[PDB]
Amino acid sequence: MKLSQDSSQIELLKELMDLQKDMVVMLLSMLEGNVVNGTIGKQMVDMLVESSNNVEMILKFFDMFLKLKDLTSSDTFKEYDPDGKGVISKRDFHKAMESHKHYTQSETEFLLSCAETDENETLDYEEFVKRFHEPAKDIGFNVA
Amino acid sequence: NANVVVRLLIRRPECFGPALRGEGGNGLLAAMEEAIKIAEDPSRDGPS
Amino acid sequence: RTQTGNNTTVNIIISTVDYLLRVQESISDFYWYYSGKDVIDEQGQRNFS
Amino acid sequence: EIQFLRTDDEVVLQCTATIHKEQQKLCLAAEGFGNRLCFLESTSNSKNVPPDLSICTFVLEQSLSVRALQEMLANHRTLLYGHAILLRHSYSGMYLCCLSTSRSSTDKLAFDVGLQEDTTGEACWWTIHPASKQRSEGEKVRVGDDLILVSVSSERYLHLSYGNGSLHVDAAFQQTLWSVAPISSGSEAAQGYLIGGDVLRLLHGHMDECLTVPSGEHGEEQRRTVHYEGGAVSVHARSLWRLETLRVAWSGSHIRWGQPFRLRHVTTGKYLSLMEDKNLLLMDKEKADVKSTAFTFRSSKEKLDVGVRKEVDGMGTSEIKYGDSVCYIQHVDTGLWLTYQSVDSIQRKAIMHHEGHMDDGISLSRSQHEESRTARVIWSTVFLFNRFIRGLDA
Amino acid sequence: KGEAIRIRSILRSLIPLGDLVGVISIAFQMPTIAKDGNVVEPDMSAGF
């Protein structure tokens, strides 16, 4: 939640997500070769319920960008931003947030804060998505 | 440095001395008054 | 994990997770240090890396 | 498998002494009303003198990490070593703290340890440190372990003052080992079942006569007698009785059939007991002996006993039910059963008998926390005012 | 800063102000001219 907002911490964010991927890989090597109703599974479920809130927050964090990619792929985004350079205004981006109707006000404002803009009060969705959606894909797949 | 030093000094209260024992200590003032008396007495100040 | 032949056995497997516990404690403490500050400096960024 | 100390679990702070070459077990205690100063109550002499764990039990609210708590102060979790804890006294509702005041007793650097209403300040929080060398900072906190507590504000360890003839809890640089014993777990507790330390009324039969002492007549000679009275006597501090188990550790466990206990009158401060001539008589804490005072419940009037059983080190099964379950009072050794004399507001004497009645079964009703606290306040105030009046008369 | 504040609290607890006042209240001895004409010196390495 903190590194994403600042533009100068993207490299550290990527390193962190690589660490996340490695830890989930180890957690799956835990379950490799597990019987039904195994003590390993019981202990990991206990771990998850102990750390429930953090898991929820991580899942919501991933789901933001998972829905962001779908919104970008949606045709309403193109009808709001017909041009090819793709530098949408922040104002148009916000009205697209509420036109999507899948994004609450909190998610909209968090994406506003995480988004980086030039002096023209405008952001580029291509830069935004390549920065955030693709890194989340494989770690989210590992968690799933 | 000062924080660490004062924490060690208070953790080992015996570093202060008989005046600042806290238990049965005559106090710093009384300690220096008795030390002055040691100074006047030759047998108590000197090796003798 | 088990040195069957040797008289004394040492659990490198357990010691590795002990070191992982210590390093995660250090990382959590360093996070709590950089919790108040708005932006992380380059020194802290390299230490995190 | 191994139990770990957790937040919101009711515990007691325990310390051991070395007075005249023996280990004396002393629990930390404090009274909410009146003075806030903490004292120690002897628990080694549990057979001769009943320990009053009611003011000794404590509840852990939060266990924050040190620097996160620092950020707090600038602005069921399992206990972990190196964490400052917030201890809330169960009865009073106030929090243990370092008073920063000194009695000028044996140490001028020492600060008295008492109870503070407000949560603000570093005095309320207490860091836990591992006194055992096997334990290290960052290890899990066992239920059975020796701990040393350091005040966050004064940086003074929780200390026991051997220097004074009367042992005192104090905040000093010197250490003292404190062992934490779990009394009960709030989450594990089940509603409607008897637990240790609960205040209850011994309402009897359909006539709903409660076992009580006579009305306040300024005479302990009248008050020491016990009888069955019915009517408005139900809602009063006289009818309140509190159950204290002989076992100190895990005293808040579910009470089971055939488990000895001590019934205490909260208002008078006296303990129910038995004379040799087979009558019930209230009699003092100091001279209240284990054999006479101890009573037990049985599921049936049927005479054969459950013998001896294993005492669980936990919450245990919840057998006795408030209201639904029917209980029978019986002495621990003589096996006599509580009986009414059938003397013809009702004023029937509570007698003790070899066989008893057919109709000696009794029911239990849980007392409200407000009424229990009020009754304790009444007792703790009447004691102080009685000693005040005696001093003025002298 | 709470750390510095509690450090000052610890220092004040260790040293009462009265002892400091009394030590300053203590006075030392005056080297004096003698009958012959020599000023007698108390030891610099002994006494106040």
XYZ file of N, CA and C in Angstrom, chain A:
432
model
N 0.812 -1.211 0.000
C 0.000 0.000 0.000
C 0.850 1.268 0.000
N 2.071 1.211 0.539
C 2.874 2.424 0.659
C 3.782 2.631 -0.549
N 4.480 1.579 -0.986
C 5.406 1.723 -2.107
C 4.676 2.044 -3.405
N 3.443 1.553 -3.554
C 2.720 1.738 -4.810
C 2.417 3.208 -5.072
N 2.103 3.968 -4.018
C 1.722 5.366 -4.200
C 2.877 6.196 -4.748
N 4.089 5.967 -4.251
C 5.248 6.756 -4.648
C 5.845 6.205 -5.937
N 6.220 7.111 -6.844
C 6.778 6.693 -8.126
C 8.221 6.224 -7.996
N 8.909 6.621 -6.929
C 10.329 6.330 -6.779
C 10.603 4.984 -6.121
N 9.569 4.206 -5.796
C 9.738 2.941 -5.089
C 9.280 1.745 -5.919
N 9.188 1.902 -7.242
C 8.683 0.822 -8.086
C 9.662 -0.350 -8.105
N 10.965 -0.057 -8.084
C 11.963 -1.124 -8.082
C 11.889 -1.942 -6.798
N 11.771 -1.265 -5.653
C 11.624 -1.973 -4.388
C 10.321 -2.760 -4.352
N 9.261 -2.211 -4.951
C 7.997 -2.936 -5.035
C 8.155 -4.229 -5.827
N 8.859 -4.166 -6.961
C 9.110 -5.361 -7.761
C 9.939 -6.393 -7.009
N 10.973 -5.944 -6.294
C 11.761 -6.862 -5.476
C 10.882 -7.534 -4.432
N 9.996 -6.757 -3.813
C 9.100 -7.316 -2.813
C 8.183 -8.368 -3.408
N 7.642 -8.102 -4.598
C 6.753 -9.077 -5.223
C 7.512 -10.337 -5.635
N 8.789 -10.206 -6.020
C 9.596 -11.405 -6.248
C 9.758 -12.204 -4.958
N 9.958 -11.505 -3.837
C 10.006 -12.176 -2.538
C 8.682 -12.862 -2.209
N 7.562 -12.192 -2.490
C 6.244 -12.792 -2.314
C 6.084 -14.066 -3.122
N 6.484 -14.041 -4.389
C 6.434 -15.227 -5.228
C 7.272 -16.362 -4.664
N 8.492 -16.070 -4.206
C 9.331 -17.118 -3.628
C 8.724 -17.733 -2.373
N 8.173 -16.905 -1.482
C 7.594 -17.437 -0.250
C 6.380 -18.313 -0.540
N 5.538 -17.911 -1.499
C 4.400 -18.750 -1.884
C 4.880 -20.039 -2.538
N 5.977 -19.974 -3.299
C 6.540 -21.191 -3.879
C 6.963 -22.156 -2.777
N 7.606 -21.637 -1.728
C 7.970 -22.494 -0.603
C 6.727 -23.041 0.093
N 5.682 -22.221 0.205
C 4.452 -22.685 0.839
C 3.792 -23.804 0.041
N 3.900 -23.768 -1.285
C 3.422 -24.869 -2.115
C 4.313 -26.100 -2.039
N 5.627 -25.911 -1.897
C 6.498 -27.055 -1.656
C 6.201 -27.699 -0.307
N 5.635 -26.936 0.632
C 5.053 -27.550 1.825
C 3.987 -28.578 1.462
N 3.016 -28.192 0.632
C 1.873 -29.053 0.353
C 2.165 -30.145 -0.662
N 3.262 -30.048 -1.408
C 3.570 -31.097 -2.374
C 3.612 -32.457 -1.687
N 2.761 -33.371 -2.148
C 2.658 -34.689 -1.554
C 1.911 -34.710 -0.235
N 0.732 -34.096 -0.199
C -0.084 -34.016 1.007
C -1.327 -34.881 0.851
N -1.651 -35.638 1.899
C -2.841 -36.482 1.912
C -4.053 -35.647 2.302
N -5.250 -36.199 2.091
C -6.470 -35.507 2.486
C -6.541 -35.423 4.003
N -6.959 -34.258 4.506
C -7.026 -33.989 5.943
C -5.655 -34.162 6.593
N -4.645 -33.562 5.966
C -3.295 -33.671 6.479
C -2.986 -32.628 7.539
N -2.050 -32.986 8.421
C -1.605 -32.054 9.452
C -0.956 -30.821 8.835
N -0.290 -30.989 7.690
C 0.314 -29.848 7.005
C -0.759 -28.847 6.601
N -1.836 -29.343 5.991
C -2.925 -28.466 5.601
C -3.595 -27.823 6.795
N -3.811 -28.601 7.861
C -4.396 -28.025 9.068
C -3.540 -26.882 9.599
N -2.221 -27.081 9.655
C -1.348 -26.046 10.195
C -1.340 -24.811 9.309
N -1.364 -24.996 7.989
C -1.369 -23.823 7.125
C -2.701 -23.090 7.192
N -3.802 -23.816 7.376
C -5.064 -23.119 7.570
C -5.031 -22.334 8.875
N -4.431 -22.908 9.919
C -4.289 -22.174 11.172
C -3.445 -20.920 10.971
N -2.362 -21.040 10.205
C -1.535 -19.884 9.878
C -2.345 -18.809 9.163
N -3.144 -19.215 8.175
C -3.922 -18.248 7.410
C -4.949 -17.544 8.287
N -5.646 -18.289 9.149
C -6.654 -17.648 9.989
C -5.986 -16.751 11.025
N -4.771 -17.105 11.454
C -4.019 -16.216 12.333
C -3.655 -14.917 11.624
N -3.247 -15.005 10.357
C -2.879 -13.838 9.563
C -3.981 -13.423 8.591
N -5.246 -13.553 9.003
C -6.372 -13.355 8.093
C -6.420 -11.957 7.488
N -6.236 -10.914 8.301
C -6.425 -9.550 7.811
C -5.413 -9.199 6.724
N -4.151 -9.580 6.925
C -3.121 -9.286 5.935
C -3.400 -10.007 4.624
N -3.872 -11.254 4.704
C -4.215 -12.003 3.498
C -5.346 -11.312 2.747
N -6.363 -10.844 3.476
C -7.461 -10.102 2.865
C -6.966 -8.846 2.162
N -6.097 -8.083 2.827
C -5.603 -6.845 2.237
C -4.766 -7.124 0.991
N -3.930 -8.165 1.038
C -3.134 -8.539 -0.133
C -4.043 -8.936 -1.290
N -5.077 -9.729 -0.998
C -5.988 -10.170 -2.046
C -6.722 -8.995 -2.678
N -7.184 -8.042 -1.864
C -7.809 -6.837 -2.404
C -6.826 -6.028 -3.245
N -5.576 -5.930 -2.786
C -4.556 -5.201 -3.531
C -4.350 -5.807 -4.911
N -4.272 -7.136 -4.979
C -4.140 -7.794 -6.275
C -5.391 -7.608 -7.127
N -6.572 -7.725 -6.512
C -7.820 -7.639 -7.258
C -8.020 -6.268 -7.883
N -7.479 -5.209 -7.269
C -7.580 -3.900 -7.913
C -7.000 -3.939 -9.321
N -5.769 -4.435 -9.465
C -5.128 -4.443 -10.777
C -5.722 -5.518 -11.681
N -6.203 -6.618 -11.093
C -6.885 -7.626 -11.902
C -8.122 -7.041 -12.579
N -8.886 -6.215 -11.861
C -10.009 -5.518 -12.479
C -9.565 -4.349 -13.353
N -8.427 -3.727 -13.037
C -7.924 -2.620 -13.844
C -7.586 -3.076 -15.256
N -6.973 -4.255 -15.384
C -6.683 -4.777 -16.716
C -7.960 -5.011 -17.515
N -8.991 -5.573 -16.880
C -10.263 -5.786 -17.561
C -10.907 -4.466 -17.972
N -10.858 -3.458 -17.098
C -11.401 -2.148 -17.446
C -10.656 -1.528 -18.621
N -9.327 -1.637 -18.627
C -8.551 -1.128 -19.751
C -8.900 -1.864 -21.039
N -9.105 -3.180 -20.953
C -9.479 -3.950 -22.136
C -10.900 -3.628 -22.587
N -11.727 -3.102 -21.683
C -13.115 -2.808 -22.019
C -13.200 -1.697 -23.059
N -14.271 -1.735 -23.855
C -14.466 -0.789 -24.948
C -14.889 0.597 -24.476
N -15.553 0.701 -23.321
C -15.888 2.009 -22.768
C -14.647 2.851 -22.508
N -13.542 2.222 -22.111
C -12.291 2.952 -21.960
C -11.836 3.560 -23.280
N -11.929 2.805 -24.376
C -11.580 3.346 -25.684
C -12.538 4.440 -26.135
N -13.832 4.319 -25.826
C -14.757 5.372 -26.236
C -14.546 6.644 -25.421
N -14.048 6.520 -24.186
C -13.686 7.720 -23.433
C -12.355 8.298 -23.904
N -11.431 7.444 -24.352
C -10.110 7.879 -24.806
C -9.877 7.355 -26.220
N -10.454 8.012 -27.231
C -10.329 7.495 -28.604
C -8.920 7.567 -29.167
N -8.115 8.544 -28.757
C -6.823 8.763 -29.395
C -5.833 7.646 -29.065
N -4.806 7.524 -29.910
C -3.861 6.427 -29.790
C -2.725 6.674 -28.820
N -2.384 7.940 -28.560
C -1.292 8.226 -27.634
C -1.649 7.800 -26.214
N -2.937 7.825 -25.877
C -3.410 7.262 -24.630
C -3.111 8.059 -23.383
N -2.889 9.367 -23.495
C -2.697 10.200 -22.315
C -4.053 10.729 -21.871
N -4.776 9.927 -21.088
C -6.101 10.329 -20.635
C -5.973 11.375 -19.536
N -6.927 12.300 -19.505
C -6.973 13.264 -18.419
C -7.333 12.554 -17.125
N -6.842 13.090 -16.007
C -7.241 12.555 -14.712
C -8.740 12.701 -14.504
N -9.323 13.782 -15.025
C -10.747 14.006 -14.824
C -11.541 12.908 -15.519
N -11.164 12.626 -16.771
C -11.807 11.581 -17.556
C -11.568 10.217 -16.929
N -10.382 10.016 -16.350
C -10.093 8.755 -15.685
C -11.040 8.541 -14.517
N -11.276 9.587 -13.726
C -12.176 9.448 -12.587
C -13.605 9.183 -13.047
N -14.069 9.922 -14.056
C -15.414 9.620 -14.528
C -15.506 8.226 -15.135
N -14.419 7.710 -15.713
C -14.395 6.324 -16.164
C -14.424 5.348 -14.997
N -13.756 5.699 -13.896
C -13.833 4.894 -12.684
C -15.278 4.708 -12.256
N -16.026 5.805 -12.162
C -17.420 5.673 -11.735
C -18.364 5.223 -12.849
N -17.950 5.295 -14.116
C -18.766 4.710 -15.176
C -18.612 3.193 -15.210
N -17.450 2.687 -14.788
C -17.248 1.243 -14.720
C -18.190 0.595 -13.715
N -18.455 1.281 -12.602
C -19.455 0.911 -11.605
C -19.068 -0.343 -10.828
N -17.933 -0.954 -11.154
C -17.343 -1.999 -10.332
C -16.367 -1.463 -9.298
N -16.010 -0.184 -9.376
C -15.004 0.414 -8.510
C -15.683 1.353 -7.525
N -15.472 1.108 -6.235
C -16.009 1.991 -5.216
C -15.184 3.272 -5.143
N -15.659 4.215 -4.326
C -14.959 5.488 -4.185
C -13.577 5.291 -3.576
N -13.456 4.368 -2.618
C -12.164 4.113 -1.986
C -11.159 3.547 -2.985
N -11.581 2.564 -3.784
C -10.692 2.014 -4.803
C -10.338 3.071 -5.841
N -11.315 3.897 -6.221
C -11.060 4.959 -7.189
C -10.005 5.931 -6.675
N -10.145 6.379 -5.424
C -9.184 7.337 -4.888
C -7.822 6.695 -4.652
N -7.784 5.412 -4.283
C -6.498 4.741 -4.132
C -5.781 4.631 -5.472
N -6.522 4.320 -6.538
C -5.914 4.265 -7.863
C -5.478 5.652 -8.321
N -6.239 6.684 -7.949
C -5.808 8.055 -8.212
C -4.473 8.345 -7.538
N -4.359 7.996 -6.255
C -3.137 8.276 -5.507
C -1.954 7.494 -6.067
N -2.171 6.221 -6.402
C -1.086 5.399 -6.930
C -0.688 5.847 -8.331
N -1.635 6.405 -9.081
C -1.357 6.835 -10.444
C -0.404 8.023 -10.452
N 0.501 8.033 -11.424
C 1.457 9.117 -11.600
C 1.074 9.948 -12.817
N 1.128 11.268 -12.661
C 0.676 12.190 -13.689
C 1.747 13.235 -13.966
N 1.682 13.805 -15.166
C 2.577 14.881 -15.559
C 2.025 16.226 -15.088
N 2.627 17.311 -15.579
C 2.152 18.645 -15.231
C 0.794 18.952 -15.847
N 0.381 18.200 -16.867
C -0.900 18.411 -17.526
C -2.059 17.747 -16.797
N -1.832 17.249 -15.579
C -2.872 16.609 -14.773
C -3.425 15.394 -15.526
N -2.536 14.702 -16.241
C -2.907 13.606 -17.129
C -2.005 12.414 -16.849
N -2.543 11.208 -17.010
C -1.798 9.976 -16.802
C -1.923 9.074 -18.024
N -0.972 8.152 -18.165
C -0.955 7.226 -19.290
C -1.295 5.819 -18.807
N -2.396 5.272 -19.327
C -2.872 3.984 -18.840
C -1.932 2.862 -19.254
N -1.262 3.004 -20.400
C -0.288 1.996 -20.808
C 0.842 1.884 -19.792
N 1.417 3.024 -19.397
C 2.451 3.014 -18.372
C 1.907 2.442 -17.070
N 0.708 2.884 -16.674
C 0.104 2.431 -15.423
C -0.042 0.911 -15.398
N -0.625 0.348 -16.460
C -0.901 -1.082 -16.481
C 0.394 -1.878 -16.559
N 1.362 -1.445 -17.378
C 2.595 -2.223 -17.450
C 3.332 -2.176 -16.119
N 3.177 -1.077 -15.371
C 3.815 -0.989 -14.063
C 3.159 -1.923 -13.056
N 1.831 -2.023 -13.074
C 1.183 -2.709 -11.956
C 0.516 -4.037 -12.293
N -0.208 -4.148 -13.410
C -0.990 -5.358 -13.657
C -0.106 -6.582 -13.874
N 0.876 -6.477 -14.774
C 1.706 -7.636 -15.105
C 2.462 -8.192 -13.905
N 3.090 -7.377 -13.045
C 3.734 -7.956 -11.852
C 2.784 -8.747 -10.966
N 1.532 -8.304 -10.842
C 0.609 -8.953 -9.916
C 0.118 -10.294 -10.448
N 0.232 -10.514 -11.761
C -0.425 -11.655 -12.395
C 0.076 -12.982 -11.832
N 1.393 -13.188 -11.835
C 1.935 -14.494 -11.473
C 1.877 -14.737 -9.966
N 2.101 -13.699 -9.154
C 1.946 -13.884 -7.712
C 0.491 -14.187 -7.364
N -0.458 -13.497 -8.004
C -1.856 -13.810 -7.775
C -2.211 -15.217 -8.209
N -1.629 -15.675 -9.320
C -1.838 -17.058 -9.734
C -1.290 -18.034 -8.702
N -0.116 -17.738 -8.141
C 0.447 -18.604 -7.108
C -0.459 -18.659 -5.884
N -0.987 -17.507 -5.465
C -1.892 -17.480 -4.316
C -3.166 -18.260 -4.617
N -3.711 -18.097 -5.825
C -4.920 -18.825 -6.199
C -4.672 -20.327 -6.217
